[PDB]
UniProtKB/Swiss-Prot annotation:
This is Nucleosome-remodeling factor subunit BPTF. The second PHD-type zinc finger mediates binding to histone H3K4Me3. The gene is BPTF. Phosphorylation enhances DNA-binding. Belongs to the PBTF family. Ubiquitously expressed, with highest levels in testis. Present in kidney, liver and brain. In the brain, highest levels are found in motor cortex (at protein level). Interacts with MAZ. Interacts with KEAP1. Component of the NURF-1 ISWI chromatin remodeling complex (also called the nucleosome-remodeling factor (NURF) complex) at least composed of SMARCA1 (isoform 2), BPTF, RBBP4 and RBBP7. Within the complex interacts with isoform 2 of SMARCA1. Component of the BPFT-SMARCA1 complex at least composed of SMARCA1 (isoform 1), BPFT, RBBP4 and RBBP7; the complex is catalytically inactive and does not remodel chromatin. Within the complex interacts with isoform 1 of SMARCA1. Regulatory subunit of the ATP-dependent NURF-1 and NURF-5 ISWI chromatin remodeling complexes, which form ordered nucleosome arrays on chromatin and facilitate access to DNA during DNA-templated processes such as DNA replication, transcription, and repair. The NURF-1 ISWI chromatin remodeling complex has a lower ATP hydrolysis rate than the NURF-5 ISWI chromatin remodeling complex. Within the NURF-1 ISWI chromatin-remodeling complex, binds to the promoters of En1 and En2 to positively regulate their expression and promote brain development. It comes from Homo sapiens (Human).
Amino acid sequence: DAMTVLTPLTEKDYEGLKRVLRSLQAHKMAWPFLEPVDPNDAPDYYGVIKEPMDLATMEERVQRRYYEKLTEFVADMTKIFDNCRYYNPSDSPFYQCAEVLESFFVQKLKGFKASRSH
Ligand SMILES: Cn1ncc(Nc2ccc3c(c2)CCNC3)c(Cl)c1=O
Ligand SMILES: [Ca+2]
């Protein structure tokens, strides 16, 4: 959609973005991504992952109106899942959570884009 690329985010749009974010935070499989990765759970994580991201950081940026275009919001969300699949092996519970939660996000994102005009 060109509106995703070109149209600045409005206060109305941010009500939808908060709804998408809350739906992910409530998802059963979102537990590994609610808060930043604890370095004591993964000692070399922050030397390996250049741009870490988590849902609590995105909650702060949504509240602060940090995002100006929908592309930037999708980019932050995608970092969460791409970081996880790059650091972890395919049989990790974190990796499997990233697979289900990203599919859930795409569903919710399609819903946000569809209703963005009404
Ligand atoms: C490499 N690595 N390590 C952790 C993590 N999340 C995460 C979040 C909370 C808790 C745990 C893990 C384990 C036990 N305490 C609660 C991710 Cl997503 C990751 O990729
Ligand atoms: Ca990526």
